């Protein structure tokens, strides 16, 4: 009764980072060692837990969050990070228990002339809390004058497009990211290794 991690890692399309997706993993058996040992994952960094011990543990729920950012931003998907992505799009807590997995997806997510489907949030009144998700498109008030819902002077639509294009340098190429978080509750632990 295997955990359906394939639906996460092998999805055709990933979400924009500002609208990141989450899959709840429960009541199943998962072989984390198979993922951790795959060379196709160039980032596979765990926090508060050892990747090689994951097959020895049970959790009540496992959460798999997935999205696309560009290469230079993968470093922001870590505890303690700041920047547009960490501050405004996807935020890990200081005391994160889980793993960050990423791989270059230029062959999947770029297109000649640009793939404009993947967006990022550039402005926000405050930083996201850990695991908070903000998909609003209210006009951002950059200055002293209220915006009243209309773009204008110091009044910005909050999102931009990556426009991923295949000859971008690697720091501007798309990377698919999967964040696994391991949750232990009073409820029974239903997600175990082999």
């Amino acid at each position, epitope marked *: 009764n295997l955990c359906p991690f394939g639906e996460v890692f092998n999805a055709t399309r990933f979400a924009s980072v500002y609208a990141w997706n989450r899959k709840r993993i429960s009541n199943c058996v998962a072989d984390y060692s198979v993922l951790y040992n795959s060379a196709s994952f160039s980032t596979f960094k765990c926090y508060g837990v050892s990747p090689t011990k994951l097959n020895d543990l049970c959790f009540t729920n496992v959460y798999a969050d997935s999205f696309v950012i560009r290469g230079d931003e993968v470093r922001q998907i870590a505890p303690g990070q700041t920047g547009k992505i960490a501050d405004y799009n996807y935020k890990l807590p200081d005391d994160f228990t889980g793993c960050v997995i990423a791989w270059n997806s230029n062959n999947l997510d770029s297109k*000649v*002339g*640009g793939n*404009y489907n993947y967006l990022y949030r*550039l402005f926000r009144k405050s930083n996201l809390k850990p695991f908070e998700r903000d998909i609003s498109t209210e006009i951002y008030q950059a200055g002293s004058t209220p915006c009243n819902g209309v*773009e204008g002077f110091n009044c*910005y*639509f909050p999102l*931009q*497009s990556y*426009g991923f*294009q295949p*000859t*971008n*340098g690697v720091g*501007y190429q798309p990377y698919r990211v999967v964040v696994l978080s391991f949750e232990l509750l009073h409820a029974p632990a239903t997600v175990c290794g082999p």
Partner: nanobody, 115 residues
């Protein structure tokens, strides 16, 4: 409402220079990422250069690095592509792209380099 109108192309001799113009209407150019592409007959569209929204950070394809420069004239609501040291293989139609909810495209301007 929104449109991108290009100008400044034309015929120029190898080693010379041109300044392409991408004039926007319906949004401020400083608020949005902009990309420049080019296409030569029988070849695919080729990314050339880009400038980020709300800032001055730029990037360039290896083929034009050091010779092409993006800049903005916010008073004119215009983004320029300065092209120096032109070679015959720079001949192509040049386009500017801007995403504003969806992608808008300049009409293109022909650059032909002679030797």
């Amino acid at each position: 409402q929104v449109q991108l109108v290009e100008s400044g192309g034309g015929l120029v001799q190898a080693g010379g220079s041109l300044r392409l113009s991408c004039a926007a209407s319906g949004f401020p150019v400083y608020s949005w990422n902009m990309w420049w592409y080019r296409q030569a007959p029988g070849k695919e569209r080729e990314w050339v250069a880009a400038i980020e929204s709300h800032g001055d950070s730029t990037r360039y394809a290896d083929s034009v690095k050091g010779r092409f420069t993006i800049s903005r004239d916010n008073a004119k609501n215009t983004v320029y592509l300065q092209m120096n040291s032109l070679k015959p293989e720079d001949t192509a139609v040049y386009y500017c792209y801007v995403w504003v909810g969806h992608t808008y495209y300049g009409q293109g301007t022909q650059v032909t380099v002679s030797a």
